[PDB]
Subunit: 345 residues, 5 copies
């Protein structure tokens, strides 16, 4: 029979000389560790901090020949997660953690099973707040590439090597969605081998190609800033010569743009370059700034003979018949050159 109480201690403890402080295949080749991650929760992709919180099941597989068993009849032993403090485990860390933690609610969220030949499957639940540097040039239409790279902190490349396994290195939960992005399906899997003045260390990362749902920004930034571009066109059809209302209408619209432009970047890092939403909020700040300046020409020109008196006002109304149509052709010639530049990535 060989009950399971004795078999457990006969594999880890003083008998058989298992020493969890000494890696497998000592004084031999490296310990080929194949990895893959399941993603439960993805999101909270902040940009004030330029990080993102993920929740994964880190699986790992290596081969420890000291963990070989033939006395037992079946082909696997999913064991107590309290066993994990007794076997060797690779010292994987996330080279851009910025804060990570296990989960220990009602039990350690850990798994451990050991095939007959000695293979190990070590799945643990982790929450990471990974650091990815956002490139925000073409901001509302950007395609971020946030990474997560799994280094080794203490074993060099000739003692512990990581790998992704061939059959589906990165799964995703069945209905996993994001509030603002959409995780594209192709997930890169490339090496990131590290060299320090201590030596070289195994590294393997997995690129995630995020992508913004532009829909939210077509409802708060673009449309609400395309109306005020139209109110600045209201300052033309009124009285045809002059009034304090045109200056009033002009001054107010320039007020909203200044306030609305500031609120546009209210929740972004203070990057030192001009991003895509800036030139929009800058061009719409001209066509409002031009109307209030356009009136300054006519009212100045109007307050400036026997027969030239009638033609004198034609010097002004000839403007308002051009400005009233010159603007809505330039804003539409710009607005088509804009979206073709960013929808062409």
């Amino acid at each position: 029979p060989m009950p399971p109480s004795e078999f457990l201690d006969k594999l880890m403890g003083k008998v058989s000389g298992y020493d969890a402080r000494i890696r497998p295949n000592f004084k031999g080749p490296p310990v080929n560790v194949t990895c893959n991650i399941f993603i439960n929760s993805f999101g909270s992709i902040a940009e004030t901090t330029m990080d993102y919180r993920v929740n994964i099941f880190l699986r790992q597989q290596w081969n420890d020949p000291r963990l070989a068993y033939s006395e037992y009849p079946d082909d696997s032993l999913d064991l107590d997660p309290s066993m994990l403090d007794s076997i060797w485990k690779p010292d994987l860390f996330f080279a851009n953690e910025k804060g990570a933690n296990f989960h220990e609610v009602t039990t350690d969220n850990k798994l451990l099973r050991i095939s007959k030949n000695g293979n190990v499957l070590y799945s643990i639940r982790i929450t990471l707040v990974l650091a990815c540097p956002m490139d925000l040039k073409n901001f509302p239409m950007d395609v971020q590439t946030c990474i997560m790279q799994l280094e080794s902190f203490g074993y060099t490349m000739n003692d512990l090597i990581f790998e992704w396994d061939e059959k589906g290195a990165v799964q995703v939960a069945d209905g996993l969605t994001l509030p603002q992005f959409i995780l594209k399906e192709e997930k890169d899997l490339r090496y990131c081998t590290k060299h320090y003045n201590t030596g070289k260390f195994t590294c393997i990362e997995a690129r995630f190609h995020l992508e913004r749902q532009m829909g939210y920004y077509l409802i708060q930034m673009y449309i609400p800033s395309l109306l005020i571009v139209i109110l600045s066109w209201v300052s033309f059809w009124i009285n045809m010569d002059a009034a304090p209302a045109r200056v009033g209408l002009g001054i107010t619209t320039v007020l909203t743009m200044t306030t609305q432009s500031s609120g546009s970047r209210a929740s972004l890092p203070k990057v030192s370059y001009v991003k895509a939403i800036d030139i929009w909020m800058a061009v719409c700040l001209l066509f409002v700034f031009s109307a209030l300046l356009e009136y300054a020409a006519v009212n100045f020109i109007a307050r400036q003979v026997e027969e030239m008196r009638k033609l004198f006002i034609s010097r002004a109304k000839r403007i308002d018949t051009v400005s009233r149509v010159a603007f809505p052709l330039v804003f539409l010639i710009f607005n088509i050159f804009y979206w073709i530049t960013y929808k062409i990535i």
Copy 2:
């Protein structure tokens, strides 16, 4: 007599070979674990994060025949919560925790009693910050369905199965209320069995049908945005022909709507679809945007013969006698089609 000092150690320790690393009924059927939760505190249902904090008493019951006792005369042993580190306990976890913790103030908030036949009751106090993806299409009248699902992380479906017990799987505190929602009474109880590339794992979740108290939004969003819809009607009865006040009144009301519309979504996630409060705050942004545009017609028309001079102004006042009544019929024909669409779920 058999005092309780000796009886405790005679059930757990080296005698009798209890091994807390090996589940009950080893090499046999699964371990049928029946669960139910008491809910002390429910609330803080955030939406910037799309999660909610709960505070529950997780009860559990299974059957461990090794914990059977006949030497003792009474029918239960509510034991020391320090005992829990010595018996088998299922590795239940909350598949969408997003952060959970026990409570250990003045003692571990844990319970443990063991009937004669071997049944176990294991009640622990937990605080969870569970993740539920909010569907915010019809926002102020939405009916969220936030879940909480109790998986098993290390034992497969042929070694540990969960269940809800038939008699009241989900109680609630006696006077439990919510600040913004109302927890409906019917609580779904369905299976959520999981398949990974490690195997299959037992899962059972409990749907909670939340529902917004719409009263708060009929005091800050709808009513305060129904007044400014009326001030935009003030721009009609004044002077009957033209004045800088009508442009002034019109410009200001459009200012409030833009600011108030932005503040409407000041505390929501940046979802990429149009929600119910948006089309209201958009339609009320037209009827203000139309009045300021409506004046642009009359003032343009007025500043445009022997007998046609009197009828010429009738070309304008015929407008203001229609606009002054055409608007308050369209806003009321829309406002009835709106609330019938959302009160019909």
Copy 3:
């Protein structure tokens, strides 16, 4: 002599069979635990969360006859707080903790002394963030009743009963004050016995009758909203007939009320009922909304014969001589009915 080194171990350890896993008077009556709390720090009474942080010295007293000593000559043993992990201690918890923690700076902040007859005094320092549901109907003049109830999580009512002691169950620090409230002196002390499907459990709570310092709100909400009620009275004495200023003055005052009304509830939960500060900020939103509407009558009436021309304007100035005095009598007849309703609780 019997030095204190040997006497300590002779009371707890293997000798005498003290078993901290087994309550006093086993198989007998319950363990009458008398409690009382000293309050160091009270405050941070939030309402976005509807909780409050307290800092207390929880004292407890029971009787453990196994802790009786006659070899020692003196009448008390204030002992090492490291002793507390060795004696029985009731598993008191705070049924609405929402987060609590001990203090362990320079030592565990714990006390322990043991009279000769076996009494125990167990004082520990705790920080609690207790949950009290705020009732905010009459908001700036409300009288909250936040509680704190001390249940037992694992022992049923026939094995552990709590009580408040008769001589001053709830002290308070000598000069303890609050930033916004004033802790009234009478502190209720009533039972809160709990019944679950596990059994019944001892409970005893202590009501604290908070009460708002209304002074802060008579400086930011009421007075700053009583001036703008007066500026809306400025729109009467100017020009006696009409001007764009009256519409200008009216429009601006309605702007401030809308903005100021929103800021009034800027730091409150989104309760689904109308609170006391709302009807004030609503009534003051009418008397501003009426002036801007009051001008719409006169200016409409004025722009509407041989002898009736002079009496025609009297149709308007008869208004402004009434509105200029009708308002400051209604606002004062309302303002007296308001404060009598809320100062009468």
Copy 4:
């Protein structure tokens, strides 16, 4: 020789009967503990919470005759900070901690040396978030007195007494500065002996006299509120009789004061009394509120004979020649009485 390996264990362990659970001089006089603190970091003096974070080196000295050594030749033993779990240590705590923690980065930040006669020096690094109730009557010119008091939680006054040592009880880091305050040099050192219903307990506190750098408030509150007091003087020199601009200029300035007054207390607790910055922001709210009201007199008076027509307007311009100079004498007679009241503490 007597190497240091054996000498350490010969002082703490089973030999010599050192019992860290029993204070020095048992059954004798109290244990005179002399204290002093070095202050590394001081600041983050919040007022929404009314607390302040400090970072100190708590030194302590007492006399434990059991720690006397003559076998060793030198006059001190700066020992391993892992030793501290083995000797007696007074249970000092900070009676207004509100949250404190050790530092354990690269080692416990702890010190321990033991002179020959038995003296002990026990220096530990601590971060405290101490609670000091702010008195904000004369707010921008206030002089806070935040304290920190070092009580004993478990030993009564006849078993453990604290003291400050005579030679410099409170040092400060060499270039320690504060962002908003300036820590005055005199630091009070007085007793705070406590009496509870458990007994009396040793206490000694150290007052810190903070003091605000008023410079920041002479750049955002006072100067920016002294300009708008001047724009309200702009409403006099324009047109000498009346215009919609004066009402426009008046209405806008009253707008800024209301908004700016609210922003003045944007980051303060909701205290129930009138603070110094309030009467300034209230008096400047009158001189703007008076100009807009001052125009209401003239414009009302102007729109009210054969020879009295010319003198009739003199009834108005006599005002504007007084108001244009009466104001800038009252604002300067108030502004001198103000600063003499608060610069005289």
Copy 5:
């Protein structure tokens, strides 16, 4: 052979008398500890708190002759990071931590190797939130010098001395960048030896010369405040004599500057001195405040004979022909003196 299981215990444990509580070279010279840091993550350089979060690999090297081995054939032993609790380690701490923590995700992020002669390499991953006092005189063009100094808390200068090693004391990650600053390449390395009343303690710090990316501030503060400086120039070309629009245009521009000036310092500490962005936001607050005051002269002068009537208005238009060009020469003579003062550091 001498397998690695026995060799490990033969170096640390009871054999050979290694005592981790006693430094190397006891009763001899100090323990020369050479340090260097690798910087993974740098950033979150806050200023409300005046701190910055870093993420480093602290390496250390000393010489412990008790850790000498000749039985083993190879020249290094990268060992289990669980070994670190058994060897001597210097008690380095960061004298301005303000909060630090190790990383323990999937293993302690620690390294340990031991050359044959006894050298030790001890690399650990750390996250620090270091305190650097910001000097914000010339704010958007400032050059901060944030430090990090590595003291010894318990060993005096005659028992433990730190040093930087000569070959590259401070590396940086390969593509490390910052959101707002740029870490200059020269990194100072100077001593900071400390003297307390406990003795003297080894200290060595490393200055980091940060430097602001001024680009962000040329897009939100300077340019958006250079437009409104131009709108205040719009108040000249309109009507050449007077209008309510000029007062309207003037009043509004002064509004934006006041609001925009406040928002300029919306995210900075309340420093008690005038910083560089203040005099810009103050000078631009004059040229707007002068235009609204400039109109007060002309409109006052205009409303003030047979032949002097025509020359009387020339007394006013002579102004507007000077003010319309006097301003854009002073703003450009100031604007060149400004940037030469701050680009000259």
